[PDB]
Amino acid sequence: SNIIKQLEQEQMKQDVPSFRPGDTVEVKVWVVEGSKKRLQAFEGVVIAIRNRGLHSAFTVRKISNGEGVERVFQTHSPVVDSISVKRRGAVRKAKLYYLRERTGKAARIKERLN
Amino acid sequence: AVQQNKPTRSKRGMRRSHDALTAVTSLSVDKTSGEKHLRHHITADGYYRGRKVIAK
Amino acid sequence: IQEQTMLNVADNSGARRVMCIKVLGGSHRRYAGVGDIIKITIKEAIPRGKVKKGDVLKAVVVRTKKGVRRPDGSVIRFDGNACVLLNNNSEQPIGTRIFGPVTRELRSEKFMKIISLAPEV
Amino acid sequence: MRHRKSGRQLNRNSSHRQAMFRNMAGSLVRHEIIKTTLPKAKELRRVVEPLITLAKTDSVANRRLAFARTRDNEIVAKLFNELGPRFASRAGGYTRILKCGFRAGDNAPMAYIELVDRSE
Amino acid sequence: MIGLVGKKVGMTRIFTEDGVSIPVTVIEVEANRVTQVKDLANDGYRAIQVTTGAKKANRVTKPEAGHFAKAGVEAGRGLWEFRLAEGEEFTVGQSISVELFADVKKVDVTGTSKGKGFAGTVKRWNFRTQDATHGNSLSHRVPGSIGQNQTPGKVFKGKKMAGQMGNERVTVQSLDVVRVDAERNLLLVKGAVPGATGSDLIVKPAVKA
RNA sequence: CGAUGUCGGCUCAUCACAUCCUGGGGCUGAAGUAGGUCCCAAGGGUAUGGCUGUUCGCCAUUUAAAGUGGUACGCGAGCUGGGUUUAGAACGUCGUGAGACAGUUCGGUCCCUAUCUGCCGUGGGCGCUGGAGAACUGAGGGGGGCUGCUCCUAGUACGAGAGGACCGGAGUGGACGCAUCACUGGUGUUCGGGUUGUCAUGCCAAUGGCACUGCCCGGUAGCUAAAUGCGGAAGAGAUAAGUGCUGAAAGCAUCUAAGCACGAAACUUGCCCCGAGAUGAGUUCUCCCUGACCCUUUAAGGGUCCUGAAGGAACGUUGAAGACGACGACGUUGAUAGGCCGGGUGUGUAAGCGCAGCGAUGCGUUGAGCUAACCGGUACUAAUGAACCGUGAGGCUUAACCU
RNA sequence: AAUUCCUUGUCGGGUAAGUUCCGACCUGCACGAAUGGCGUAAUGAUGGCCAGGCUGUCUCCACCCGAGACUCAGUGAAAU
RNA sequence: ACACAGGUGGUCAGGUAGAGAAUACCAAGGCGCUUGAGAGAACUCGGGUGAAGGAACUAGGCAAAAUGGUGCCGUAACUUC
RNA sequence: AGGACCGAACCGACUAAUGUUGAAAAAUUAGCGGAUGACUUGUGGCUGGGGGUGAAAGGCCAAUCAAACCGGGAGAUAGCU
C-alpha cells in the first residue's frame, strides 16, 4: 500500500553501508548490563537479504570460541549503531549456507565490484 | 450402506423437486443483424454486437 | 531442548554428552530453550571428573540450535546444544570453567555465577 | 485454500501445460484466430502477450528468448517481423476473446481468441 | 463509550528508542459520519448510526440515498451502530474522528475472519491425526469415534466435526494503541487483528480494561 | 444361535459425585510451616517414559493434581490386530493310538459406493398480510471458566530454637483457545542459477525436450508454527456448608418460629459468538406504485386494454469469498480481471562483442539479464442496449384524534 | 530351557527406569542320550535383544505436485 | 464372461554413455492406452520438501529415510583352515 | 572346479500399501530369494477315484478333494425346520 512505508520511510536510517554476501563486516551493537550502556563488537561473514524496507535483516556468522554463532540483525534497529565493511569477498551466491556450515574453508577477496 | 425400507414415490418427488432446469429467459437481438443470440456470445452468423467479427 | 535430546556439556567437570530425560516446570512441558533447568542422564563420561556415567542430575541449557530471540527482532543461532551441569539439590554449577559462549538470558543469580566464568556473553 | 494465487491447473501437469501453451501460442501466431476452450484462451492471453511485448524490441537476445519460448523459428520470424511492428504504438491488449457456443461431445464453453489487428 | 469504523491496511513494526520493535497493524479510520441517532422514545434503546468512506452514487440505491440525504448528505460504504448510555451525539458527522482515541490505552478490535472454507477436523479443531505407518487403512486424518454406542443411540448436538472455518466475526480484546495520527487518519494498535487487508474493522475501547 | 464381533491400544468423547488439584468452612491430641478427619462444591484441569499383548502392577522423572466409576468391561458400517480363538510345526505332559492341554513356542485374508434417524456446514421454496434497500432490540442457544514460581508486605505474627504465615499487592511462566504473517522459519514442481547422460533446433555459440521438478542451490505471493499479539478475570444478584445480630415459644438459654446481615471457581449475570421460522414470525429509518373498463353464484371475485415503479434476478470481468449454491467488488457515468509501464523482490555479473592464455577458463561491457502470486499507475482487450421478474395506494371488526 | 506351575525365581550385566535379552545358580511341577544328548565354522526373505547412521514413525504436523471426490454434458449399475 | 492392468514357446538385437540382453535418451517401426470440460473444498490414493529433536511412535524401526560404483590402502572374535 | 559370489532374461512369492459389488473368482506398485542346477521350459505320452501322485501340506487330481465329475438306484432317509 501507500499508507504503509510512509511511516517506514521516516523510520529508516540512511547511514547503512553497502554489503554483499561474503563480506566480513563488524557490527557494533548496544548492550545493557546494568545502568550503563556499552558497545559490543560482532565480526563475521554476511549472508544477507536485499532491502525489504524497514524489515531488512542480515545474517552474519562468527566462530567465537570454537562454536559457530549465527546472528541476524535488523538493519534499521536502534540497537545496531554502526556497521563497518572490513574485508570484502567474492562469492557467487546470495545465500552462503553450504559455505557457512563447513569449517576451515575461507572466502576469497575481490578488489572491485564486491 | 443399504436401505432398510423402500423409499416411496413421494420421497422421490421431494428429492427431484430441485432437479429442474432453468431456461435462459432472455435472448439478446443484435443490431447489425436481427437474429437472436445468447448474451455475450457470437450470433453464429459471425456477428458480435458491433460488426461481423468472424468470417466463418 | 526436548526429551531424549542429546546435548553436549559446556563445563569441564560435566562430561561429554548427556541425554535430556525431563524438562522441568509445568505439567506437560514440551520444550526448554535456554534459561530453564532440565534433567539429564550422563551417556559419556571423561575418566577424570566427579561426573560418572549414568548419573541423574540437572542442567541449564547454555546453547541451543534454535536459539533465543532478542526483543529488537534478532535471533542468536548456535550450532549445537550445550548445557552446564548443576547440583541436584542445591542447583549450583559443578565445574570450574565454562567452555564456549553463554547467552545473556542466563542473567539471574546462579546463572550470573555462570556469567562470572563464561568467556563470551 | 488458494488465496492471492494465479494461473490455472487445467487438469494437467506442469510440463504438459507448458507444451500445450507453446503449441497454442504458435498456432495463434500462425493463424491469427483460433478456437479453443474458454480457460485455455484466458491463459493464452497471459502467455501470448509477453511474446508480442518481447517482439516489440528487436535484438538477438530477444529472438533467442522468444525461441526459448515457442521453439519455432517460423513463429519467431513472423513475430519479430510482423507482430509488434504492427502493435508498436499499442500498449497492451493484443488479443480479443469472443465467446462462442458449446462443443457437441461435451458442453465445453468455447471461445475465439484473435489478434486485434488481423491482416485477413 | 462509543467507537468507530476503520479499514485494515496491513502490519508493520514500530522501532522504539529502547529497541522494543513493537508489532503493529495500521487501521485507516476516516471521518465517521453520524447518520441516525436512536433514543429511548422511538426505539427501545440508545445508540448512533455511523458511516464511513464514499460510494460511487450508481451503486447507491434510492432508499440508501434517502437515508443519507436525511440530515447531512454523504454516501458511505456501509452502516454500523454503537451503543451509548451517558453520551449525547449530534446527527452531523465527525470532523477529526480518530482523536477520540488519543486518550484511550487499550482498545478491542472487531473484524471478520479470513475464510479457510470447508475445513477438516485437524484444521478446524486441534484434533489428533491417527497413525501414518502402522496399518491405518484409509484413516489418517479422519474423525475417529463420533459417539457412544447404543445407550445414547445418537450423536450429540455439539459434536465437533468437519465444516466451514472462517468468515466469522472475531472480536480481539485489549490491544494497546501506540499512535493516533489525526492528519494521517490512522490508528496503530499492537499485534494481530482479524481480517485481510481491506476488511472492515470496528475499534472500541476495551470492556475488560 | 435363518450371526448382537472378544481383551488391550489409537482417535473422539459425554455423564455421576462416593472430590486428586484449585475454591469455601466445623473439629483437632490445630503455635507457625505442615497436616489428620468431616461438611459444601462438578466450573476448569487431572503426566512422560522402561518392561509386558496387556487393564493392572513395579520402577525412573515431573506435576497443583497425576480421581473413582457409568456409557454393549463407551467407541472394529472409525483404525489396529500384539492377546484370545481354525487349518502348518515343535517342546513338557497325558494316551497303545488317532489326538489332547485355562501349558508354552514360531507363522497366520479385519468387506460395505449411507436410504432413514443423528450430528457438522451450506442453500432452494414459502410464510411474516402492498413491494423493496438496509440498521437493529434480544426470547433463547452455545463458547470460556485451569494454574505454578519469584518479589513486597516480612525473616513480620507465631515459636526456646529450628523454621515460618494468614490477609493484600506485583512480575513472569506451563498447558489450552482465538486471530495473524510485521519478525524468525517451513513449503513454495508457475522465479532465477549451477550441473550429469542423451536427442533435436544444419553446425560453433545459445537454447529446448526427457531422465522423481533429472539432481541440487536459493526464493516472491498465499498457506503455516516452531513465530507473534490477545484471552478466560475484575465487579454484581441469589445461595450451599458455615458464622452471626435481635428474639419468644420454654420468665433463662437459642442463627429462627416473626425480622435482619455476611458466605464458594457451583447458579443467574457480567466477557465472546449465533440469534425474530421468537408462526409469540418483533422495532426503526428510507424508497416506490395514487389509469380506463367488461362479465358475474355476488360470506366474493374472474377477464381485456394501457402501464411496469422502487428494487431484484439473468449475463459478463472477478475476489485475501467459495465443493455447488451463497457472499463481496465491478459492468464504458469503469480500475473488475488480463495486458502494458514504473518499482519492489528473488536469483546472482545474461546474450553478443573485445582482451589475456596452448586450452579449460578468467576479465571488461555489468549488480548485468530474467523475474509469479506483490505495490503504484494506464482504458489497450473483455465487462453490449437491451431483454426478464416484480405492478397500479394494499382486507374485516372495534376504539382514540379529527372531521 | 521352543520344556519351569509357583515366576516378573535369586544374583550379575546392559537402561534414568528392563515381565523381554545375555551370564550364572539348580528348587529338573514335568531335560537327557539315533523318538538322539551336548557343541559348532559357514548358511537363513528363520525367532529374540542391544548399538551407530538415518530419518514425518513421533513431539505436531505444514505446504506442494498429480489421480479421484466437487460442478456441467453423454452413457449409466449394485447389494437391500 | 468383457475391446479384461493377468497367462502365452521360439527367432532378430541399431546409436551414445555403460561390464551388460541393467539403465537414461534415441534410430527403423509403432503408438497417445474409446468419455470429456471446468473449479482447485474436506477426505482417500501415489509422490516431493521440511525448523528443533532423532525411535520419545509402536506388539515390533511396520513404513519411509539412509548407504550403494571403480582403483588403492586396511580389516576382528571364531574356524571344518 | 563349484547343488560357489554379485546381478538381468527366466523361475519363485518374504514384507508393506492399494484393491475387497476389484482392472483381476489371489492382481498391481515398491522393495525381496534362486539365477550351471535337486534349475527352468516347449511338444507328445503314462499313472483313475478307498484309486493315482506327493523333497509330506490331507497337498494336487480341470476356479471343486478327510475321497473328483457325470448318469442311474432316487421322489434314499430326515422323531428336524
B2 CB contact with strand I at below 7 Å? no
Q: Which candidate from D99, D112, D120 shows the least CB-CB separation from B40?
A: D99
Cβ–Cβ gap C74/A72 under 8 Å: yes
Query: Which residue type, as a one-letter code, is found at position C87?
Result: N
Establish if A110 touches chain E: CB-CB under 8 angstroms.
no
Amino acid D97 CA to nucleotide F337 C1' distance, rounded Å: 13
Chain D residue with the nearest C-alpha to that of E165 = D1
Say which residues have a Cβ less than 8 Å from residue E102's Cβ, sequence separation at least 6.
E180, E182
Establish if E19 touches chain C: CB-CB under 8 angstroms.
yes
F206 C1' closest Cα residue: D64
Q: Of A44, A51, A38, whose CA–CA distance to A107 is shortest? A: A44
Q: Of E195, E169, E173, E175, whose CA–CA distance to E187 is shortest? A: E175
C28 CB contact with strand H at below 7 Å? no
Which nucleotide's C1' is closest to E133 (Cα)? Answer: H63
Beta bridge partners of C37: C60
Number of domains in chain E: 1
Beta bridge partners of C57: C40
Please give the DSSP secondary-structure letter assigned to residue E183.
Answer: T
User: Strand H within 7 Å of which CB atoms in C 59-88?
Assistant: 64-66, 80-81
- Which chains, if any, share at least 3 CB pairs under 8 A with chain D? B, E
If DSSP codes are grouped into helix, strand and coil, which group holds residue E80? strand
Rounded to whole angstroms, the maximal C-alpha distance in chain A is: 48
d(CA D19, CA D13): 10
Q: Of A17, A24, A27, A43, whose CA–CA distance to A88 is shortest? A: A24
Residue C37 has φ and ψ, to the nearest 5°, of -110, 130
DSSP-assigned states of every residue in D51-79: HHHHHHS--HHHHHHHHHTT--HHHHHHH
Number of H helices, E strands in chain B: 1, 2
d(CA E22, CA E188): 11
Q: Of E76, E71, E170, E160, whose CA–CA distance to E115 is shortest? A: E170
Q: Identify the domain containing residue B34 by its residue range.
A: 1-56
* CA distance, residue E80 to nearest chain D CA (Å): 28
CA distances from D114 to D29, D33, D44, E100 (A): 9, 4, 10, 58
Task: For chain A, give percent helix, strand, coil, nearest 5.
Answer: 10, 35, 55
C107 CB contact with strand H at below 7 Å? no
CB E73 within 8 A of CB E129: no
Q: Which candidate from E10, E15, E18 shows the least CB-CB separation from A4?
A: E10
Indicate the helix (H) or strand (E) that contains C76. Answer: strand C75-78
Cβ–Cβ gap B54/D33 under 8 Å: yes
If one counts every other C-beta atom within 10 angstroms of the C-beta of residue A18, the result is: 6
B in contact with C (at least 3 C-beta pairs within 8 A): no
Indicate the helix (H) or strand (E) that contains A70. Answer: strand A68-74
Cβ–Cβ gap E20/C73 under 8 Å: no
What grid cell was written down for D94?
A: 493484443
Chain A residue with the nearest C-alpha to that of E198 = A1
Amino acid E192 CA to nucleotide F122 C1' distance, rounded Å: 29
C-alpha dihedral (A102, A104, A105, A111), degrees to nearest 10: 140
Establish if A11 touches chain E: CB-CB under 8 angstroms.
yes
Number of domains in chain B: 1
Q: Of E167, E165, E170, E168, whose CA–CA distance to E194 is shortest? A: E170
Query: Which residue type, as a one-letter code, is found at position D50?
Result: P
d(CA E33, CA E4): 10
d(CA E60, CA E42): 26
* Mutation target among C79, C104, C108, C117 for the A interface, most CBs of A within 10 A: C79
Identify how the structure was determined.
cryo-EM
Query: Which residue type, as a one-letter code, is found at position E198?
Result: G
Strand order in the sheet with E47-51: E33-38, E47-51, E80-83
* CA distance, residue D1 to nearest chain E CA (Å): 6
Amino acid A87 CA to nucleotide F253 C1' distance, rounded Å: 101
Please give the DSSP secondary-structure letter assigned to residue C114.
Answer: H
Establish if E198 touches chain D: CB-CB under 8 angstroms.
no
For strand H, give the nucleotides within 7 A of a protein CB.
35-45, 51-60, 62-63
Each residue of A19-49: b (16+ CB within 10 Å) or e? Answer: bbbbbbbebebbeeeeeeeeeeebebbbbbb
Using a CB-CB distance cutoff of 8 angstroms, which residues of chain A are in contact with residue C78? 67-70
d(CA D112, CA D96): 8
Indicate the helix (H) or strand (E) that contains D119. Answer: none
Amino acid D27 CA to nucleotide F99 C1' distance, rounded Å: 84
Number of H helices, E strands in chain E: 2, 11
d(CA E175, CA E193): 9
Give the residue ranges of DSSP H helices in E70-132: 121-124
d(CA A57, CA A70): 12
Say which residues have a Cβ less than 8 Å from residue D21's Cβ, sequence separation at least 6.
D43, D44, D47
If DSSP codes are grouped into helix, strand and coil, which group holds residue A46? strand
Say which residues have a Cβ less than 8 Å from residue E113's Cβ, sequence separation at least 6.
E166, E167, E168, E169, E170, E194, E195
* Residues annotated within a binding site of D for Mg(2+): 3
Residue D50 has φ and ψ, to the nearest 5°, of -60, -30
Q: Identify the domain containing residue E5 by its residue range.
A: 1-209
* CA distance, residue C76 to nearest chain A CA (Å): 4
Say which residues have a Cβ less than 8 Å from residue C60's Cβ, sequence separation at least 6.
C35, C36, C37, C38, C83, C84, C86, C106, C110, C111, C114
Which nucleotide's C1' is closest to E135 (Cα)? Answer: F80
CB B23 within 8 A of CB B14: no
Beta bridge partners of D98: D112
- Which chains, if any, share at least 3 CB pairs under 8 A with chain A? C, E
d(CA E177, CA C88): 46
